[PDB]
Structure formats: C-alpha cells, structure tokens
A paper describes a structure:
The fungal H+-ATPase Pma1 belongs to a family of membrane-embedded ATPases that pump ions across cellular membranes, a process energized through transient phosphorylation by ATP. Here we report a compound library screening campaign that identified a series of Pma1 inhibitors that exhibit broad-spectrum antifungal activity. Computer modeling, supported by structural biology indicates that the compounds bind to a groove at the intracellular membrane interface, similar to other P-type ATPase inhibitors that block the ion entry channel. The overall topological organization of all structurally characterized P-type ATPase family members, such as SERCA, the Na+,K+-ATPase, the plant H+-ATPase, the CopA Cu2+-ATPase and the Zn2+-ATPase, is very similar and it is therefore unlikely that the Pma1 structure deviates significantly from its other family members.
To complement the functional data of the tetrahydrocarbazole compounds with structural information, we collected X-ray diffraction data of an inhibitory complex of compound 7 bound to SERCA (rabbit isoform 1a). This complex was formed in a Ca2+-free so-called E2 state and used an ATP analogue, TNPATP, to stabilize the flexible nucleotide-binding region of SERCA, which has been well characterized both functionally and structurally. The 3.0 Å crystal structure of the inhibitory complex shows compound 7 bound at the cytosolic membrane interface, in a groove between transmembrane helices M1, M2, M3 and M4. Despite the modest resolution of 3.0 Å, difference electron density maps clearly allow the placement of bound TNPATP at the ATPase active site, two lipid molecules at the luminal membrane interface (modeled as DOPC), and of compound 7 which is cradled deep inside the cavity marking the cytoplasmic end of the Ca2+ inlet channel of SERCA. However, an anomalous difference map visualizing the isolated signal from the heavy bromine atom in 7 reveals two distinct peaks (5.7 and 7.3 σ) in close vicinity to the tetrahydrocarbazole core. A model with two alternative conformations of the bromo-phenyl moiety, with an occupancy of 0.5 each, allowed a straightforward placement of the bromine atoms into both anomalous peaks. The tetrahydrocarbazole core (modeled with an occupancy of 1) is held in place by three polar contacts to SERCA residues D59 on M1, N101 on M2 and D254 on M3, as well as several hydrophobic interactions involving V62, L65, L98, L253, I307, P312, I315, and the Cβ and Cγ -atoms in the side chain of E309. Interestingly, the SERCA•7•TNPATP complex protein has crystallized in a previously unreported crystal form, reflecting a novel overall conformation of the ATPase. The three cytosolic domains adopt positions roughly halfway in-between the Ca2+-free E2 and the Ca2+-bound E1 state.
Residue numbers in the entry: 1 to 277, 288 to 994
Write the structure that this text describes.
C-alpha cells in the first residue's frame, strides 16, 4: 500500500482486509509472503562466481600463468623418461596458486562489498503483532512481518516495518526518527490523515518508519510496506553500482603488468635466438618459458596487498574511522583540502547558555544594560546566575522573568535524568535543551526544588511556566527571517486580563529590526536608534570575543493578530505575523572547540592540507571561530577568504571559482553549495574530503572523492559516504589521512621488495638459458619463494612504522610513479646481483665444491652433450647435472638474500646503521619464520623430494652467507649515493 499516510485508519484497514482486533489469518500471511516476499533487505545480487572467473581470465598476467599451466601440464605428460611420472606437482601447484588468487580477490571483494551493509544493521531482530492465532500479541521474527498485519510498539522499541499508526494508546507518542530524516527532536505523532500524497516524511506525522525508535508512548498500527518498499529500504535502491573506475595504484600496477608481458616475450625470443646450431630441444625453450613466466609474476602480491589493507582498515576502524569504500585508503593520502562542518565535529555540540542580558535603563541617547553570566556547562540544572561576579536571584528582575518564559516556551525539547549514568542528558535538540537548563538555573518564580529528586528537578521550573502560559501553537523557524515564535494564552484562569501573547526567539539581526519597543522590566518604551546600537554592540562583542558565543534574541509581540485570521499553511506570512515586537533580551550560548582541533588543524597546514570550515554562524562569528581554532591568525586580514551563501551566490561564475581557490570559511550556505564548492575544488585538481550528516548532504558526498559521513548522522549520508566518523571528531579525519599516508609508503616498499625480488629470478633464469647451464631454479621452488618465504616479510613490511616527517610533506599526487628514475637503477642492479649470485651458487657446487664433481665450465655449459661416456666428460655420471645439491645452493641464496633485502626494504633511503632492523619487530619474525619454513622444506622427508632439495652441510651454508650477505653492503652503498649525492 502506497501513500497510506494520506488515508484514514478505516481506509487502510478496509484496504488490507484486516481487523484491528483479529489481526491477519495464517492464510493471509502465506498469501502476503508470496506477494511481498520477506521483510528484509535481500541478499546481495548481480554477483556471479562463474561470471567473475571471466574477469580473472581477462587479466593479462592470469592469462600468462594459465598458459604456463597448460605448458607445464603437457611437459610433465610427455617426459615419461628419466624421471618419475609422479611429477605432476608443478602444473597442479600452478593451478592452485591461480585458483587461490581467484579466491583471494573474491574473498575480500566482499570486504570492499558489505560497505553498504552498514544499513542492514539498522533493522531489528523482533517485533510484536496481533494475529488470528491467539487473542494476545505474538512476538515474531521481524523478517516475517508481512504487509498488513497489526503491529504494537512501545517505548524503546525499534519500528520493524513502515507502519501507519492506528491508535496511540498512551497520552502522547514521540518518535526518534533522526536516523532517517535527521530530525534531532522526537516527533509528535498523531492518528489523523496527513493530506498530501507526495508529502515529505518529516510531514508524515501519522507514520512509523522502520529502523526508527520510540522516544515515549505506546501505539498500535498496521504495516503499510515491508522490506525494500520501506523508506529506509528505499535507501538501498541506488545500491551503488555506479561507474567503477580503477584506482591509481590499480592502473599503475597494470602498466607494469604489460611491460612485464613485453619483457617476458623478448627474453623468450632472445634465448630461442641465441641458441643457434628436435623433440629434446622443443622441451627446452618451453620449460624455460614456464620458468620465465613464474619468475616474472609476483604471484603473491595481491595476497599481501589485500592483507595489509585489511589490517590497516581495522587499525583505522579502532581510531574511530570506519572505512566503507576500500579504494579510499589510497585516496586518503592524496587529500589536499579537508572541508568540514563546525558544530558537532569541530566542537562538542554540548550547548550551555554562558551569558545573557536585558535592558537596565533608558534615558534619551543613553542606554545601560544588565549583563548576566551563568556557571555550569553541562545540561545539569546546577549553577549560579551572576551579575558582576556575585549571585543574583533571577526572579527579582522582571526582564529575566520574561526571558525565562520565552526560553521555556519557544522550546520543543526537554531535560532528562539518566537513572543509570547519574547524569542529565539531552532530549531533542541541543541548542534548545541549553535553554531548558537555563530556565531551571534561573527559577524565576522561586519554585521550591530542594527536596525534589534528580528526576523531578529536570523540568520543574519549565513546567511552572507551562502552568502559566499554554502553548497554543508554534510558528516554525524559517531561514529567510531566521526566527521562530509561539502563540500562547493564559492558563491559570484565576489570573485575568493578561491576554494572548507571541514569544519570538531568533537570530539577533532580523529579530531586532522587527522590534518597535524595548521592555524595561515590566514597562515598555519604543525602540530607538541609540538603544538598538548598544544592543548590537554587546552582541557583536560576545560573538567576536575570546569566548565565541552564538547569540539569540528573545522578543514578544504584545498584541498578536486574531488567531482566526492567521493562516498557518504558508511560511511566507510568518515573518509579518512577528512584527511590532518588544525586545526582551539576548542569550549567548557557547559550544567550545574540541581539546584537539587546534593542534589537529596545525598538522593539516604542516602537511599542506587546506581546511574549509562550513558553519551556520554569522560571518562575523564564523571568522572569529576560525582565528580561535587556528584557520586564521588573530591579526591576519581574512577579507578575501570568508564568504556567505548569499555573498557567494552574488559573484558571477568566474569570481566564484577563484574564491574556492583561497577560501577557508563559509557561513550560512544553502544545501546546494557544498556540491558546488566540491566542483570548483575539482577544477583545481584538488582532492577533497567533504563531511556531511544530514539528508541533503548525500550528493555532495557522492561527488566528493572522500565523502565523510558522521556516525551520529542520517542513514543516507552514511550510504553516499566513503568513510564514517564513529566518534564524530574532526581529528579522527586527520588521523585517518595520516594513517592512509603511512599505509601507502609501506605498500610501496613491499611492492618494490617483491617485484625487485622477481627481477633477480628472471635474471637467474636468463643466465641459465644464455650460458647453457643446467637449471638452477625450478618453478616449484620459485612459487614457494614468491608466495611464502617472500610473502611473510612482504606483509610485515606493511607494518613498517611511519616516517617522522609523515605529516610534514605535501599530499602525494595521484600520478606519483611507483619508482623514480634512480630507483629503477637501484633495483635493476640488485636484481642483477641476485641473478648472478644464484647462478654462481649452483655453478660453484658443480665446479668448486668438494662434494661436487668439480667439472669444467666447458663441461658444465655443454652438460647436455654427455650422450654416453664421453671423452669430454671423463669420469662423470650424466645424471650429476640433475643433482639436487646445486639447486638447493641457488634456492638457499635466493631465500637468504630476500631476507636481507627485506631488512633493506625497511627503508627506501635510510641506512640500517641509523634505522636498525629491530625497528619493525614484526619483520624480524617474518624472517625467522621464512627461514624456518626453509629448513622445514629441507628436513621433513616428504618435502625435499617434492621441491627437489637436499640439506646443505655447514660448508655449503657458509658459502651461502659468503655469497648472499653482500647484498646488504650493496644496498647500503646504493642508499649512500641517494642521501649524499643525488638530492645534493
Ligand atoms: C656475483 C658473483 C656470484 C659468485 C658465485 C661463485 C662461483 C665460483 C667461486 O666462487 O669459486 C672461486 C672461489 C671458491 O672458493 P673455494 O675455496 O671454494 O674454491 C674451491 C675449493 N677447492 C680448492 C677446495 C676445490 O671463490 C672465490 O674466489 C670468491 C668468493 C665468493 C664470495 C661471493 C661474494 C661477492 C662479492
Ligand atoms: C657467475 C655468473 C655471473 C656473470 C655471468 C657472465 C659470464 C661469465 C662466465 C664465466 C665462466 C666461468 O665462471 O667459468 C670459468 C672459471 C672456471 O672454469 P674452469 O672450470 O675452466 O676452471 C677450472 C676450475 N676447476 C678445474 C676447478 C673446475 O670459473 C670461475 O673462475 C668462476 C669464479 C667466480 C668469482 C666471483 C667473484 C665476484 C666479485 C666481483 C664481481 C661481481 C659482478 C659480476 C659481473 C658479471 C659480468 C658483467
Ligand atoms: N542556510 C542557513 N541560513 C541561515 N541560517 C542558517 C542556515 N543554516 C543554518 N542556519 C542557522 O545556524 C544555526 C546553527 O548552525 P550550526 O550549528 O553552526 O551548523 P548546522 O547545525 O546548520 O550544521 P550541522 O548540524 O553540523 O550539519 C541554526 O540555528 C537556527 O538557524 C540555524 C535555528 N534552526 O536551525 O532551527 C533555529 C533558531 N531559532 O531561533 O529557532 C535559530 C537559529 N539561529 O539563530 O541560528
Ligand atoms: F599469479 C597469479 F597470476 F595467479 O596471480 C597474480 C599475481 C599478480 C598479479 C598482478 C596482476 N594480476 C595478477 C595475478 C595485474 N592486475 C591485477 C591486480 C590489480 C590491482 C591489485 Br591491488 C591487485 C591485482 C597487474 C600486475 C599484478
Ligand atoms: K565518492
């Protein structure tokens, strides 16, 4: 049933064929389950495992490795002679590593997915329905509440569906629906039809929305829509699925992927070309092509990448930064401008009326004032009211009595006592509750409150004013006039002839212009120029002083219009109905900046991040706040870097864009302006973190490259967001950007470490083919390196502790190459030394090791010419070239160097003498475990037969360290030219 908000109780009942006492029949339930599905957000769709395999097949390197599989398969098939046929392990392993990688990408594609699942969290487990089974209410699983059944809800329950209220059983019904509308005040719900069929949800005051909770009361309704049809379920309809564009790192990695394709193909052609001058031969340059493919591809890199991301996500997630979109962590390092709202994010949103003034005397041009101050900054109703630092019984001033009345009446919020926490808490809007607390502190009628209870005391004095003036109706706040008013009539009935009143509170600018009189206690004197000046002179002093107060003016229309001649259907006339007012006084409440923000702001400048503050204060106060928290200097001229929504809109398009180039402070912007500022910032290739919590903030969060939504905010903003501030703190953003920087510098390290490791293997294979030597590494050994003995240090590298200057450098540009020009030189030379060292390791055994045959280099590089007992190969067994020992020398050198390179990769440019190995203790363990797995693979008797290895003696090991360790002295020397001859 659509638009049930416009239909009467009887109509919705007549629509579904239900009784308000009998409920639904099980037969009706079956029929509805069929015609409406269950009451839940359906499981993820559009994702096919088989169709996902196509994406893996489409990737280039997967195509290569898949081709290396079929080759390795046919090679093991054909080569029955001179080897055991139980040697299909290599093609099998190739497939498994390919299968594993497919699983891996899918496995945490669900981590990039379920970002939108943060909305599935808002629906409840259970609900209550009256049904045709029992005369009492049955508690059903919420996902089985079909449309049409009668639902009961009480205090503190979650509304389990979208329900048209049928009959409120308690006195009144208040519904917290902030989660869906942003309404920070519990809405009064009624049972009448709201007439407009397309009215906004804020007007649907007869509807219960799923996912919202009941502030107070108890009602009975009938389910109008379930699951997706609900307004909270309408949020899932977009379901992302927008244009998906590769991240900059994803794009760069793929360019390396194809340069790797070119390089493999060329080497493959070169060795087929070098061999100048058959079945046994067709084997060779296919075997090495497999050895080539396996040696070039990092194999385990996606596993390491998606792991260090997951652990970084949880690191950030415990710093109150909830990463929805995973590509964000890359983007977070490139953040050039954070643009955030003031209230609740730069400040505590913990309101307290700090100062207030009424008029003292008026003589001609002169106008004195009675200024008051109030101790206590919590919502607790405790503290003095001060005049000249001394206590004052507020009720002695008739001007304060009227101020207290206006505050208590121009108010839709209240105070509550949390029985468990033992503290006073905010009900409804924070800025209104500040007035509630102020009234209780003033106590203008000297209501006896001492012997009350912590609960009763919360609203005693507010209730006393409610006992005097009966709030007939309210004139809602509009932004054109920046004020609201309430029409009240006397309720004592014993007291006579007071008359109907209208109490107006609003921004001092507009309210004061619509005043014609100033109340002096109980007397009335017309509004004059000299007095209005002194009023604004203190309002401006307060909103610009060291305490930076938002100010509110309180007024009264002494003679309101005829209640039967006011038309409440159109806001446009509301301002006129608040004319001929009498200025009563002004309250000034503080909302102090969070302890951290001043320092957190400083970091953004040190790191080259511009901070734009969007706020609703006046341009005067907005500028002042920016000096207080440090966006501007106290003595700096900020004329050109602070704008208002109307000022900004006055500039032509060209002058608009130049403003965002330099601006840092926006006051009172329309909703559309956030999205317009982002567009302008994009025109300068600036990468923006933009914050929002409200329902209108959605498009500027989809548009911003890093949409940041508030944890206490609406559901829609969270959905359009890339990240969520669980603690609402602005410093959580800075900490998020900082962490996002460290992670990329660590991804860069293990990317280089793994790929430079790959280079050494490609060199080793290439020399073997070029020199005609026997194979020194076989693909099974390489995969064990590129997946295990390298993967563990590669991961632990991602935990390299951040640089000390990490927040003293400009944002990384999105086009920043993975390697500089010189890094290409450094890693080629190391990958070269790694290639030569592994081949020489095996050659040393064949020619010089005591256990080895001690053959000559001509013999060794013609080892396949050992057809029979040759005169050339005198005293040798042909098989000695297939011996496990030379391979195990090479693999042991490849492993040991990659442990040393891991120690080198601890820093891109720092010596190990300055930043020692134990700086990353997680990395030491990764090396201890990789080496352990190497001794395991040599010593547990199923394993050596597989990988074709044999345990080295003490001599052969000391030869590995003889060979391997200099790679440290090589990189240390290479790191020297960097920090001493390249930058200067
Ligand atoms: C980069 C190049 C890779 C190095 C590979 C070395 C292969 C050949 C080799 O190294 O054979 C030369 C000697 C070996 O020494 P040996 O005593 O085992 O000779 C034989 C012992 N016999 C007399 C009892 C039989 O090694 C030496 O000259 C050189 C010492 C090797 C240390 C590598 C460090 C690189 C700088
Ligand atoms: C190795 C891979 C490195 C580069 C490849 C380029 C081509 C080099 C081929 C050389 C041939 C070869 O090695 O066999 C020649 C001699 C042994 O032959 P034989 O059996 O006739 O002798 C009799 C010995 N009997 C009777 C005991 C068996 O072997 C030797 O002396 C090998 C001694 C190796 C000494 C390593 C010292 C490292 C120090 C600094 C340089 C490092 C950078 C490398 C630069 C590469 C070039 C650009
Ligand atoms: N586009 C705008 N043009 C003009 N003023 C704007 C605009 N947007 C917001 N304001 C005013 O600024 C006040 C608080 O803004 P501020 O807390 O700085 O930031 P926001 O709460 O708007 O943003 P956030 O909640 O953090 O997303 C609001 O209080 C009030 O009017 C609102 C308000 N209200 O929002 O309901 C009621 C009120 N009385 O008296 O009822 C007085 C306000 N006031 O004096 O500012
Ligand atoms: F060895 C397998 F083929 F099985 O696994 C891999 C290992 C590494 C890569 C690489 C790619 N496909 C691979 C597939 C290519 N793009 C896939 C990819 C893109 C971004 C991220 Br993050 C991870 C992988 C480009 C080089 C890196
Ligand atoms: K976005």
């Amino acid at each position: 049933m659509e638009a049930a908000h416009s239909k009467s109780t009887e109509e919705c009942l007549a629509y579904f064929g239900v009784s308000e006492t009998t409920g639904l029949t099980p037969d009706q339930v079956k029929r509805h389950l069929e015609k409406y599905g269950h009451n839940e957000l359906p499981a993820e769709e559009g994702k096919s495992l088989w169709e996902l395999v196509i994406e893996q097949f489409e990737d280039l390197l997967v195509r290569i490795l898949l081709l290396a599989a079929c080759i390795s398969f046919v090679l093991a098939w054909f080569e029955e002679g001179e080897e055991t046929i139980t040697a299909f392990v290599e093609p099998f392993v190739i497939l498994l590593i390919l299968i594993a990688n497919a699983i891996v990408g899918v496995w945490q594609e669900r981590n990039a997915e379920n970002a939108i699942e943060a909305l599935k969290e808002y629906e409840p487990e259970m609900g209550k329905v009256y049904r045709a089974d029992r005369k009492s209410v049955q508690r059903i699983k919420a996902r089985d509440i079909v449309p049409g059944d009668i639902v009961e809800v009480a205090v503190g329950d979650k509304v389990p569906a979208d329900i048209r209220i049928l009959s409120i059983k308690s006195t009144t019904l208040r519904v917290d629906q902030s989660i869906l509308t942003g309404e920070s005040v519990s809405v009064i719900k009624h049972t009448e039809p709201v007439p407009d069929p397309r009215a906004v949800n804020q007007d649907k005051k007869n509807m219960l929305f799923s996912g919202t909770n009941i502030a107070a009361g108890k009602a009975l309704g009938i389910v109008a829509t379930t699951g997706v049809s609900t307004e909270i379920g309408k949020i899932r309809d977009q379901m992302a699925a927008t244009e998906q564009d590769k991240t900059p790192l994803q794009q760069k990695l793929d360019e390396f992927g194809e340069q790797l394709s070119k390089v493999i193909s060329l080497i493959c052609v070169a060795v087929w070309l070098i061999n100048i001058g058959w079945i046994r031969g067709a084997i060779y340059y296919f075997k090495i092509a497999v050895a080539l493919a396996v040696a070039a591809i990092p194999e385990g890199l996606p596993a390491v990448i998606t792991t260090c991301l997951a652990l970084g996500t949880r690191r950030m997630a415990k710093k109150n930064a909830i990463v929805r979109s995973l590509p964000s962590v890359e983007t977070l390092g490139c953040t050039s401008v954070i643009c955030s709202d003031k209230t609740g994010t730069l400040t505590t949103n913990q309101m307290s009326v700090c100062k207030m003034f009424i008029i003292d005397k008026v003589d001609g041009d002169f106008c004195s004032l009675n200024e008051f101050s109030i101790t206590g900054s919590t919502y607790a109703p405790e503290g003095e009211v001060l005049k000249n630092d001394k206590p004052i019984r507020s009720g002695q001033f008739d001007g304060l009595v009227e101020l207290a009345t206006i505050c208590a009446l121009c108010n839709d919020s209240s105070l509550d006592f949390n029985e468990t926490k033992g503290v006073y808490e905010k009900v409804g809007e924070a800025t209104e509750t500040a007035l509630t607390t102020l009234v209780e502190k003033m106590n203008v009628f000297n209501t006896e409150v001492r012997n009350l209870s912590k609960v009763e005391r919360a609203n005693a004095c507010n209730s006393v004013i409610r006992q005097l003036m009966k709030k007939e109706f309210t004139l809602e706040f509009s932004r054109d006039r920046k004020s609201m008013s309430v029409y009240c009539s006397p309720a004592k009935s014993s007291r006579a002839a007071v008359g109907n009143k209208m109490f107006v509170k609003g921004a001092p600018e507009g309210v004061i212009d619509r005043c014609n009189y100033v109340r002096v206690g109980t007397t009335r004197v017309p509004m004059t120029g000299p007095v209005k000046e002194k009023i604004l002179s203190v309002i401006k002093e307060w909103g610009t002083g060291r305490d930076t107060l938002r100010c509110l003016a309180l007024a009264t229309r002494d003679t309101p219009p005829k209640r039967e001649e006011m038309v409440l259907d159109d806001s446009s006339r509301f301002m006129e109905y608040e004319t001929d007012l009498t200025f009563v006084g002004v309250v000034g409440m503080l909302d102090p900046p969070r302890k951290e923000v001043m320092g957190s702001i400083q970091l953004c400048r040190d790191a080259g991040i511009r901070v734009i503050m969007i706020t609703g204060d006046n341009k005067g106060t907005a500028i002042a706040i920016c000096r207080r928290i440090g966006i501007f200097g106290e003595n700096e001229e900020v004329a050109d870097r602070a704008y208002t929504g109307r000022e900004f809109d006055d500039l032509p398009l060209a002058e608009q864009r130049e403003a965002c180039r330099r601006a840092c402070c926006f006051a009172r912007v329309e909703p559309s302006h956030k999205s317009k500022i982002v567009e302008y910032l994009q025109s300068y290739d600036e990468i923006t973190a933009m914050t929002g919590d409200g329902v209108n903030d959605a498009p500027a969060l989809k548009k911003a490259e890093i949409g940041i939504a508030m944890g206490s905010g609406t559901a829609v903003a969270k959905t359009a967001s890339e990240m969520v501030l669980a603690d609402d703190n602005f410093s959580t953003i800075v900490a998020a950007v900082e962490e996002g920087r460290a992670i990329y510098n660590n991804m860069k390290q293990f990317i280089r470490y793994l790929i430079s490791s790959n280079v050494g293997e490609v060199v080793c294979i290439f020399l073997t083919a070029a020199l005609g030597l026997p194979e020194a590494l076989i693909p099974v050994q390489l995969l064990w390196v590129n997946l295990v003995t390298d993967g563990l240090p590669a991961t632990a590298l991602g935990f390299n502790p951040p640089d000390l200057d990490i927040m003293d450098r400009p944002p990384r540009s999105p086009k920043e190459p993975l390697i500089s020009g010189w890094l290409f030189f450094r890693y080629m030379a190391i990958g070269g030394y790694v290639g030569a060292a592994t081949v020489g390791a095996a050659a040393w055994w064949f020619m010089y090791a005591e256990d080895g045959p001690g053959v000559t280099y001509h013999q060794l590089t013609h080892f396949m010419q050992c057809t029979e007992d040759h005169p050339h190969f005198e005293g040798l067994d042909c098989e000695i070239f297939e011996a496990p020992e030379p391979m195990t020398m090479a693999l042991s050198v490849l492993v040991t160097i990659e442990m040393c390179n891991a120690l080198n990769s601890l820093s891109e440019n720092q010596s190990l003498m300055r930043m020692p190995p134990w700086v990353n203790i997680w990395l030491l363990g990764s090396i201890c475990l990789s080496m352990s797995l190497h001794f395991l693979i040599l010593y547990v008797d199923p394993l050596p037969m597989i990988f074709k290895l044999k345990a080295l003696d003490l001599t052969q090991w000391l030869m590995v360290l003889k060979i391997s360790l200099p790679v440290i002295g090589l990189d240390e020397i290479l790191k020297f030219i960097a920090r001493n001859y390249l930058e200067g």
